[PDB]
Structure formats: structure tokens, C-alpha cells
Design an enzyme around this catalytic site. Structure first.
Site, PDB file in Angstrom:
ATOM      1  CB  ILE A 182      -7.394 -33.141 -31.514  1.00  0.00           C
ATOM      2  CG1 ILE A 182      -5.993 -33.709 -31.842  1.00  0.00           C
ATOM      3  CG2 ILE A 182      -8.476 -33.929 -32.242  1.00  0.00           C
ATOM      4  CD1 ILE A 182      -5.580 -34.912 -31.021  1.00  0.00           C
TER       5      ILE A 182
ATOM      6  CB  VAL B 217     -13.929 -30.936 -42.328  1.00  0.00           C
ATOM      7  CG1 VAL B 217     -14.347 -30.894 -43.795  1.00  0.00           C
ATOM      8  CG2 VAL B 217     -15.039 -31.516 -41.453  1.00  0.00           C
ATOM      9  N   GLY B 218     -12.263 -32.814 -40.037  1.00  0.00           N
ATOM     10  CA  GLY B 218     -11.732 -32.955 -38.683  1.00  0.00           C
ATOM     11  C   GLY B 218     -12.792 -32.766 -37.618  1.00  0.00           C
TER      12      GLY B 218
ATOM     13  CG  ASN C 208     -10.697 -38.242 -35.786  1.00  0.00           C
ATOM     14  OD1 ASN C 208     -10.548 -38.250 -36.997  1.00  0.00           O
ATOM     15  ND2 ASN C 208     -10.410 -37.192 -35.048  1.00  0.00           N
TER      16      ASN C 208
ATOM     17  CG  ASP D 251     -11.289 -45.474 -29.611  1.00  0.00           C
ATOM     18  OD1 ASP D 251     -10.263 -45.960 -29.077  1.00  0.00           O
ATOM     19  OD2 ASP D 251     -11.501 -44.270 -29.692  1.00  0.00           O
TER      20      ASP D 251
ATOM     21  CD  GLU E 277     -15.224 -35.084 -41.050  1.00  0.00           C
ATOM     22  OE1 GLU E 277     -15.396 -34.901 -42.276  1.00  0.00           O
ATOM     23  OE2 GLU E 277     -14.098 -35.310 -40.567  1.00  0.00           O
TER      24      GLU E 277
ATOM     25  CB  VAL F 231      -6.220 -26.406 -33.940  1.00  0.00           C
ATOM     26  CG1 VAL F 231      -5.345 -25.966 -35.120  1.00  0.00           C
ATOM     27  CG2 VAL F 231      -5.766 -25.709 -32.666  1.00  0.00           C
TER      28      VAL F 231
END
Ligand SMILES: N#Cc1ccc(O)cc1F
EC number: 5.6.2.2
Length: 185
Positions: free
Chosen positions: A79, A84-85, A31, A58, A27, A82
């Protein structure tokens, strides 16, 4: 985040057989790849630390830091907290450290079980840009398989390197010095 804490396996996958544990890494990597794609150098680094935390870095622009005008906290905290993230990863990490290099400034924030310990804060100046998350999976959630398996991470990062053929992906294991560099050209 309480919905995730209530039923972790429903968001991250099986929390007893290692599946969910490794999904945590993937996950975060998703990102990081998105961020790396928006930059010039396009490299991510995944590190398995000796305390069985994982970091993902990164060299992109840095995730946004400004106060989200609707939520009233930093966009980075929105981020993280709140739904799947990465917010799921945060909720299920006993500790998570966030570092953002952006607009000449280093920003840092610590979470424990998804709860910010203080607001995202400027800690110094820098010429570099990018984002780094290091997370310690919660051992209250993840049972039996609690240690990362290099090969599981390597297999998936290899698949991702071919799909995202402009992105360099480094994998490092500080437990035994094992390392890979996935890059398609
Ligand atoms: N969220 C998130 C996130 C984690 C690591 C990284 O290198 C970049 C990111 F946007």
C-alpha cells in the site's frame, strides 16, 4: 514511486501554493475513514503537530500486515510503495511513521522519502486495533507554504463528517491547542 518523485505536482497538486500540502492530509484521511467505517467505534483523529507533521489515526481493524504473496513484502508496505493513494503521500514525505494494531500485536515501520528503513515489524502486544500514520512533508518538494493551516483542514473534515455521518472526526492543533469535533450522528 519514481514517477511521483519526478512530477510531484501532477499527483498531489500545486507544491508552491499550499494546495498539494493539504491534499497530503486529505489522501491519508480518505483511507482512515474507510478503515473507521469497517469498525465498531468509528472515530478518526487528525493531529497537527508542532514540528508541522500531521498524524491520522483510526480505531478500525488495522490495515493488513501479512506478506503479500505476489510482492513478497507486507501488505502494508505494498500500500505504501506501489502506485491518488497514500503511496503518493509517502513518496513526498521526508519521513513517514506507520503503526498498526491488529491480531493482538503492535506493528511499526518507518519510511524516508518513500523508502522503507526496515520491514514492517512486530514491536509489542496490544488489545486495541487500528492504524496510525504520521508524515513529515518533504521540504525539498513543498515550497513557500510549508505549514498547515487549521482552517483548510477543518473545512474539508467538516464536509466529510456530513457525508460519512456515522464517523466521528477529531481535529487537534498542538501548535496552539485549537480543537474541533465533527460528528453528524
Ligand atoms: N494508508 C493509510 C491509513 C492512514 C491512517 C489511518 O488511520 C488508516 C489508514 F488506512
Amino acid at each position: 514511486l519514481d514517477a511521483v518523485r519526478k512530477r510531484p505536482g501532477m499527483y498531489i497538486g500545486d507544491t508552491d501554493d499550499g494546495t498539494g500540502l493539504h491534499h497530503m492530509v486529505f489522501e491519508v484521511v480518505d483511507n482512515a475513514i474507510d478503515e473507521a467505517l469497517a469498525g465498531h467505534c468509528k472515530e478518526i483523529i487528525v493531529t497537527i503537530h508542532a514540528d508541522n507533521s500531521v498524524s491520522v489515526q483510526d480505531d478500525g481493524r488495522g490495515i493488513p500486515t501479512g506478506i503479500h504473496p505476489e510482492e513478497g513484502v507486507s501488505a502494508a508496505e505494498v500500500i505504501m510503495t506501489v502506485l491518488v493513494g497514500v503511496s503518493v503521500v509517502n513518496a513526498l514525505s521526508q519521513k513517514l511513521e506507520l503503526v498498526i494494531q491488529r491480531e493482538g500485536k503492535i506493528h511499526r515501520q518507518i519510511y524516508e522519502h518513500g523508502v522503507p528503513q526496515a520491514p514492517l515489524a512486530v514491536t509489542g502486544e496490544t488489545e486495541k486495533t487500528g492504524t496510525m500514520v504520521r508524515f513529515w512533508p518533504s521540504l525539498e518538494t513543498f515550497t513557500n507554504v510549508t505549514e498547515f493551516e487549521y482552517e483548510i483542514l477543518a473545512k474539508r473534515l467538516r464536509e466529510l463528517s456530513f457525508l460519512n455521518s456515522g464517523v466521528s472526526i477529531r481535529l487537534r492543533d498542538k501548535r496552539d491547542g485549537k480543537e474541533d469535533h465533527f460528528h453528524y450522528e
